[PDB]
Enzyme design. Structure first.
Site, mmCIF file in Angstrom:
data_model
loop_
_atom_site.group_PDB
_atom_site.id
_atom_site.type_symbol
_atom_site.label_atom_id
_atom_site.label_comp_id
_atom_site.label_asym_id
_atom_site.label_seq_id
_atom_site.Cartn_x
_atom_site.Cartn_y
_atom_site.Cartn_z
ATOM 1 C CG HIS A 122 42.112 47.277 38.381
ATOM 2 N ND1 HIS A 122 41.812 48.466 37.784
ATOM 3 C CD2 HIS A 122 43.409 47.376 38.785
ATOM 4 C CE1 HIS A 122 42.889 49.277 37.836
ATOM 5 N NE2 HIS A 122 43.890 48.628 38.454
ATOM 6 C CG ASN A 143 45.281 52.695 36.488
ATOM 7 O OD1 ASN A 143 44.515 51.747 36.288
ATOM 8 N ND2 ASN A 143 46.263 52.629 37.393
ATOM 9 C CE1 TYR A 161 49.833 43.689 35.179
ATOM 10 C CE2 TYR A 161 47.567 43.623 34.428
ATOM 11 C CZ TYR A 161 48.631 44.324 34.988
ATOM 12 O OH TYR A 161 48.488 45.588 35.474
HETATM 13 C C1 HDD Z 1 53.263 43.782 39.871
HETATM 14 C C2 HDD Z 1 51.938 43.703 39.962
HETATM 15 C C3 HDD Z 1 51.206 44.794 39.393
HETATM 16 C C4 HDD Z 1 51.616 46.123 39.198
HETATM 17 C C5 HDD Z 1 52.839 46.896 39.513
HETATM 18 C C6 HDD Z 1 50.443 46.640 38.499
HETATM 19 N N1 HDD Z 1 49.451 45.764 38.305
HETATM 20 FE FE1 HDD Z 1 47.756 46.062 37.210
HETATM 21 N N2 HDD Z 1 47.204 44.216 37.777
HETATM 22 C C7 HDD Z 1 47.919 43.271 38.465
HETATM 23 C C8 HDD Z 1 49.142 43.371 38.880
HETATM 24 C C9 HDD Z 1 49.861 44.617 38.809
HETATM 25 C C10 HDD Z 1 47.323 41.866 38.513
HETATM 26 C C11 HDD Z 1 47.361 41.137 39.814
HETATM 27 O O1 HDD Z 1 48.098 40.949 37.611
HETATM 28 C C12 HDD Z 1 46.001 42.108 37.832
HETATM 29 C C13 HDD Z 1 44.722 41.544 38.473
HETATM 30 C C14 HDD Z 1 43.872 40.806 37.450
HETATM 31 C C15 HDD Z 1 44.737 40.697 36.250
HETATM 32 O O2 HDD Z 1 44.426 40.307 35.121
HETATM 33 O O3 HDD Z 1 45.988 41.316 36.549
HETATM 34 C C16 HDD Z 1 46.055 43.595 37.520
HETATM 35 C C17 HDD Z 1 44.929 44.179 36.990
HETATM 36 C C18 HDD Z 1 44.883 45.499 36.371
HETATM 37 C C19 HDD Z 1 43.724 46.067 35.654
HETATM 38 C C20 HDD Z 1 42.353 45.439 35.412
HETATM 39 C C21 HDD Z 1 42.342 44.700 34.077
HETATM 40 C C22 HDD Z 1 40.945 44.253 33.799
HETATM 41 O O4 HDD Z 1 40.066 45.161 33.582
HETATM 42 O O5 HDD Z 1 40.708 43.053 33.817
HETATM 43 C C23 HDD Z 1 44.173 47.386 35.175
HETATM 44 C C24 HDD Z 1 43.388 48.400 34.366
HETATM 45 C C25 HDD Z 1 45.532 47.442 35.742
HETATM 46 N N3 HDD Z 1 45.901 46.352 36.440
HETATM 47 C C26 HDD Z 1 46.391 48.597 35.493
HETATM 48 C C27 HDD Z 1 47.652 48.914 36.055
HETATM 49 C C28 HDD Z 1 48.360 50.150 35.711
HETATM 50 C C29 HDD Z 1 47.970 51.312 34.749
HETATM 51 C C30 HDD Z 1 49.576 49.903 36.488
HETATM 52 C C31 HDD Z 1 50.766 50.763 36.684
HETATM 53 C C32 HDD Z 1 51.057 51.624 35.738
HETATM 54 C C33 HDD Z 1 49.445 48.625 37.174
HETATM 55 N N4 HDD Z 1 48.277 48.025 36.873
HETATM 56 C C34 HDD Z 1 50.460 47.989 38.034
#
Ligand code: HDD
Ligand code: HDD
Ligand SMILES: [Ca+2]
Ligand SMILES: [Ca+2]
Ligand SMILES: [Ca+2]
Ligand SMILES: [Ca+2]
Lengths: 675, 675
Positions: free
Chosen positions: B62, B135, B349
């Site tokens: 993202h 999402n 996160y």
């Molecule tokens: C186990 C790791 C993992 C899993 C399974 C997911 N994500 Fe996630 N997501 C991340 C690890 C992550 C991350 C690496 O932690 C991010 C990158 C930047 C941050 O703040 O967290 C992230 C970012 C991130 C963002 C951007 C936030 C922003 O605008 O700054 C959204 C909207 C989502 N995720 C949504 C989801 C949804 C709806 C998931 C499943 C239902 C999902 N993610 C599963």
């Protein structure tokens, strides 16, 4: 690989942690089959922590780019002009790594944005790593390094909304250009075809700054670095570049990768202009001024050697993303000049690697390591990979017998500052008056382009300046353009509904210089790697036979052939759905496919004809092979007697004509000119 | 508010260092006027050090996105279903910040890539910050968080050459999808118009996971979060999305910024489906499985309140780039479930913000701060911005009188885990057999789309799978698609020249569900903010008068009108050079401009007609206003009897008809269907 000792093989074996313990990584450890995940699941946490920390800061500039490995080979013993060891013998080979880039965009922006381009070369010499951190344009926007954040803030996206990406087409950029007239020379280069090169392989490289070559006797000469492309020079047209930015944001990196893998690794003659120290002010401008070229007519090129890129990276992140260039990576035989843009760069590149690497040991990354022993008293720091045996890391010492020894002009092949360099005067924050002519060389450049090239440059300015909201900024822009050329200012003003200011002829002249025109640089010296799209159909077995026979004859001459049809099958590479004119340097329709050029669920309405018409409109060689051309050419509104339009029954005769078209590359008679 | 306290005004004053010393920043300090730069130039180094360190790592996923501020307003006192304070009174207002995003692309990649989209909402509640990190698609690709790096590595660029950017159209992604059949449901959503939304404002948001609402008495219910767009649902067509990626990589962030600035800030009803704990396995699937929706027919939506975005950020980097969301930012009245995807997210996160921020005090950045006091024993770390007065930061203590006090279910409005939750069984790394149906819900989704939508989805798969090089991967893909729908696998196979496998009807069915179709969701409820391009000419005073009268009548109804002509002047917003059909939701040609539709130095050949034809081909309302009509419609091959084609002399009658077209938004009868 030159970096083979660092490679990790995962073609066999069982998954392990980073400490070699065999594990699994597909299911979390849970308190029962529908239970919560346990904190003691170390397999989960080590895997996710790594993922969570994969990213590093992108480069502050030149974030979008791609690289390859190769070799530099010296053409001679250059001891008569430089002590540099990598130039000291005919045939001497040195490994290199090169990265090419845009400037303004973030790391997933389009290759085919309009921009200045980077061309950074590392020579892994037997006397240390030497980097030439150059651009594809020989002059820079600004005359003092301290202004770099002003330039870059102005061209980067507006900081309230971060719009627009990878583009100078906004108020802030043109505000800066119009208020800082030093920018005019580089601006004219960026607004020419040099801003939208056909490929990294079809652009030259320049050191920009005057540097010094220093002999072992201490004498020095002033030099400019020129990497002359052996593939020739070529540009996109703007409308093409825009579409390609969407259809294939990776166009330049793909082009390089593919050329290397097909055994067509790109080559450059590495050249210098060499002049005496006494000529620093002899050519009508100051050689310390990085907004100025030395015309080839005043100082000819000397060819030093061959740069060839012939091996792609194994891991992009580890090699390309992590390579950390510095103008401070200098070797004996080379020295700096008092160019105030170069002077400040020396600070920037050492400092910025702390941001990227997060720690001081960035020279220990495999891509950054030298190919010779390291002997110094640098110690510790985060990420320290060495285990130093010398427990007395200070100079002067007796407890390590006075080692490491000092290296200088007279011992140990030390680097030394050119000994005839001096400084004299007040400590000042003042600009040399010798830097004050911002407009004559922009005019020299403009004068040196062909009439159609001049039209393209005008059109690029009309495009960008029409998107500037501020009427005051637009007026200020016409004021500066007008000092270069009244004609440019008149033609640009016509598009944006302003009056051009009255002519101011202080800097007007009619001089020209060779080697800056793309259109003028004649046919390409090779057509290997260029892309031919053959538009066919699965509805006619004869169309696919025509396509296969064309393919054989074109592939024989090293062209990259794509047969396009409604669906894939044996001999068809791409569907009409995925195909675009931006994917080809020439387009051939086989006459068995004529019926497609008058609707289908398998591709958008009109797609086959649109590919042909787009190719024609963008100046590419186009044709019909098989002898029945009228139906296709009439549907397209393409005249059969047009230059770069081909029709033949004979496959051999067709290809011979078409190949000349590909060398011509662009048919410029298809573009309208101002009256 | 922590934002207002840290706002810095530079609209007056003299330049200072970061420690308030007045300085200059335009020329380096040198040893003489043409001399070398001095190390003691602190003005130079502080400015360049800052520039050198401006960048931070992009989000691991993202990375490409945009944000805005607004307000959430509760419709009622929801105490009967949750203890959550922000929902505890009719009319209660809470500040929000929302960031929208793609998933796979780096910063700088195009908004209009085909992808899943993020919709992350922070509520700055009076009991702490609460984030719903959702999402635009209600189901996710994988069933266990530990697989996330597998998914993401497969969809991101191939790691040898970092190609291709922001796209699933490559072998690794389809290898993963074909080997991990959990991916089918989300894959179908991403291959529908949900993968290429018209704007952030025209998409819904989903929490994806089942969560719990917890009352002050300790009872719980299972919930799903649904943010329902009040702007309606709308998509691009693929060919349009591709062109837009090149013409305007910032299309979604621009659309959001502009809507907010014009006072058309987007709104969503924040809704939940609420079911009893006993129904976890009652609907034919497991509510812990994030690859599954609850059909609206089984559990209807309750509207909790209004989310409105109505203020743009001041500084993008400080607010949008630095905002750091966490599902761990939870408040009393909400709890987690044992969804193994959610469970792992809670770890990720908190950990990843260390990468982005470079230190542990990321919750102190203004955008991340809460709007209530912080009382805890967290201390020190890099970037510590607080001065803590409590010098006994440990529990239990007497030397600070036992403060801060512990908060829990009974005192201090503490968060508490839902007290009915239990766990029982072996400690296992095993997948629940209740998660094993990967294909029925993909089929439910496909069945619920209109015939033309089904064709678009098939077309998106034909496009992407045709670019996969491996024949084996393509076969594996057909195997999985075939388990969802034999018809899909047959239609996809036709394009890539393979045979579909024999029907396997284990998971086939004809059930449908409401609210997943875009085409089916009826006309848009508002046309405010939609873009009308009026194609005119400066040749004819009457063309500009036609354009101006149209403009007045369209602007009255809140449409964003652009008059296009050869050159700018009063009444003309854009040149044909910069104009594209991708910039408009509807295109009108004025009669007076007919002659342009049959060459000029001011725009590429055929540009005026191309805009009109492109708009028609992409399904947009198009028309000619003036009542000659035939000449332009004939040139375009646009039939006058066509749905969404308008032809009127009267401006009033023209606009009345055209506005209904804009509400219809897309005319789907212009797209071919498989037999
Ligand atoms: C186990 C790791 C993992 C899993 C399974 C997911 N994500 Fe996630 N997501 C991340 C690890 C992550 C991350 C690496 O932690 C991010 C990158 C930047 C941050 O703040 O967290 C992230 C970012 C991130 C963002 C951007 C936030 C922003 O605008 O700054 C959204 C909207 C989502 N995720 C949504 C989801 C949804 C709806 C998931 C499943 C239902 C999902 N993610 C599963
Ligand atoms: C005072 C600051 C400053 C100034 C005046 C310049 N640069 Fe620079 N340049 C940087 C500060 C910098 C940097 C911030 O230090 C970068 C970012 C990443 C890195 O390693 O260095 C950079 C990167 C960078 C790269 C990318 C190297 C790579 O691919 O990794 C190229 C090719 C150049 N620059 C070229 C130039 C040329 C040809 C210049 C003028 C003749 C120039 N820069 C002036
Ligand atoms: Ca701007
Ligand atoms: Ca050109
Ligand atoms: Ca791949
Ligand atoms: Ca508890």
């Amino acid at each position: 690989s030159p970096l083979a000792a660092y490679e990790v093989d995962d073609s066999t074996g069982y998954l392990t942690s980073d400490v070699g313990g065999p594990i699994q990584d597909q299911t979390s450890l849970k308190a029962g089959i529908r239970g919560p995940t346990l904190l003691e699941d170390f397999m989960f946490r080590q895997k996710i922590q790594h993922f969570d920390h994969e990213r590093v800061p992108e480069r502050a500039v030149h974030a979008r780019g791609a690289g390859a490995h190769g070799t530099f080979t010296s053409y001679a013993d250059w001891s008569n002009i430089t002590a540099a060891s990598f130039l000291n013998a005919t045939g001497k080979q040195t490994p290199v790594f090169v990265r090419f880039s845009t400037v303004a965009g973030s790391r997933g922006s389009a290759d085919t944005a309009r921009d200045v381009h980077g061309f950074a070369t590392r020579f892994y010499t037997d006397e240390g790593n030497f980097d030439i951190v150059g651009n594809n344009i020989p002059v820079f926007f600004i005359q003092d390094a301290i202004q770099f954040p002003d330039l870059i803030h102005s061209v980067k996206p507006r900081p309230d909304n971060e719009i627009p990406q990878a583009a100078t087409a906004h108020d802030s950029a043109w505000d800066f250009f119009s208020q800082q007239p030093s920018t005019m020379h580089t601006l004219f280069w960026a607004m020419s075809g040099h801003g939208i090169p056909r490929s990294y392989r079809h652009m030259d490289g320049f050191g920009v700054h005057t540097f010094r070559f220093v002999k072992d006797d201490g004498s020095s000469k002033l030099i400019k670095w020129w990497f002359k492309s052996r593939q020739g020079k070529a540009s996109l047209v703007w409308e093409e570049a825009q579409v390609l930015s969407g259809k294939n944001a990776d166009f330049h990196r793909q082009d390089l990768w593919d050329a290397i893998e097909s055994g067509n690794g790109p080559e450059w003659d590495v050249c210098v202009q060499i002049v005496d120290e006494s000529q620093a002010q002899a050519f009508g401008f100051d050689l310390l001024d990085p907004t100025k070229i030395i015309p080839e007519e005043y100082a000819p090129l000397t060819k030093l050697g061959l740069l060839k890129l012939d091996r792609n990276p194994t891991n992009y992140f580890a090699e390309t993303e992590q390579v950390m260039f510095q103008p401070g990576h200098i070797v004996r035989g080379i020295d700096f000049t008092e160019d105030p843009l170069l002077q400040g760069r020396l600070f920037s590149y050492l400092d910025t690697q702390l941001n990227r690497n997060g720690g001081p040991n960035f020279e220990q990354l495999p891509i950054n390591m030298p190919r010779v022993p390291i002997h110094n008293n640098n110690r510790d720091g985060a990420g320290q990979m060495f285990i130093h045996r010398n427990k007395y890391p200070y100079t002067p010492n007796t407890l390590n017998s006075g080692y490491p020894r000092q290296a200088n002009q007279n011992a140990g092949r030390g680097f030394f500052t050119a000994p005839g360099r001096t400084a004299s005067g007040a400590l000042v924050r003042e600009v040399s008056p010798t830097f004050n002519d911002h407009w004559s060389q922009p005019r020299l450049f403009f004068n040196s382009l062909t009439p159609v090239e001049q039209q393209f440059l005008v059109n690029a300015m009309r495009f960008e300046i029409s998107l500037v909201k501020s009427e005051e900024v637009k007026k200020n822009v016409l004021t500066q353009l007008n000092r270069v050329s009244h004609d440019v200012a008149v033609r640009v003003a016509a598009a944006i509904g302003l009056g051009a200011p009255d002519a101011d002829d202080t800097y007007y002249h009619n001089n020209k210089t060779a080697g800056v025109s793309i259109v003028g640089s004649g046919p390409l010296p090779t057509i290997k790697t260029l892309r031919v799209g053959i538009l066919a159909t699965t509805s006619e077995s004869s169309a696919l036979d025509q396509a296969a026979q064309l393919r054989t004859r074109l592939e024989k001459d090293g062209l990259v052939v794509t047969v396009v049809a409604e669906t894939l099958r044996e001999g068809v590479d791409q569907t009409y759905s995925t195909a675009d004119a931006t994917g080809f340097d020439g387009v051939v329709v086989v006459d068995g496919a004529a019926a497609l050029f008058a609707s289908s669920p398998l591709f958008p309405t009109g797609r086959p004809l649109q590919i042909f018409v787009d190719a024609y409109r963008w100046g590419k060689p186009v044709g019909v092979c098989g002898g029945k051309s009228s139906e296709v050419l009439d549907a397209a509104d393409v005249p059969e007697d047009g230059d770069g339009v081909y029709s033949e029954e004979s496959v051999d005769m067709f290809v011979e004509e078409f190949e000349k078209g590909l060398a011509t590359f662009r048919f410029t008679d298809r573009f309208a000119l101002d009256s």
